């Protein structure tokens, strides 16, 4: 973790809460960001949020309460970004 990337997924009635589906540090983080550009997936920079998610919510885990509001804000941004 010079570089961190956290991939969040939310789909109604499927994921009960936002789900971390993938994470990466360093080269893998860089690759995730490059793949995001290729697939036009919204990417948002937030240093303390990225660190906290990386430390606390592992791949395949749902976010916990302390993350509800910041992640909810990210998802509201994302779903209309660059339309």
């Amino acid at each position: 973790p010079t570089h961190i990337a956290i991939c969040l997924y939310y789909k109604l009635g499927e994921t009960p809460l936002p789900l971390v589906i993938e994470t990466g540090k360093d080269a893998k983080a860089l690759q995730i960001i490059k793949l995001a550009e290729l697939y036009d997936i919204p990417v948002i920079e937030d240093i303390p949020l990225a660190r906290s998610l990386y430390k606390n919510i592992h791949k395949g885990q749902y976010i916990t309460e302390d993350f509800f509001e910041p992640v909810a804000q990210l998802i509201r941004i994302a779903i209309d970004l660059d339309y």
Binding site: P1, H3, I4, A5, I6, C7, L8, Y9, Y10, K11, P18, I21, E22, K28, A29, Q31, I32, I33, L35, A36, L38, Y39, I41, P42, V43, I44, E45, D46, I47, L49, A50, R51, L53, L74, I75, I77, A78, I79
Partner: peptide
């Protein structure tokens, strides 16, 4: 292979957060 499997996973993502 990682890259093609990472892509196949990643591509459904709603949002990616980075530092």
């Amino acid at each position: 292979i990682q890259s093609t499997s990472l892509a196949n996973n990643i591509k459904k993502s709603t949002v990616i957060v980075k530092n």
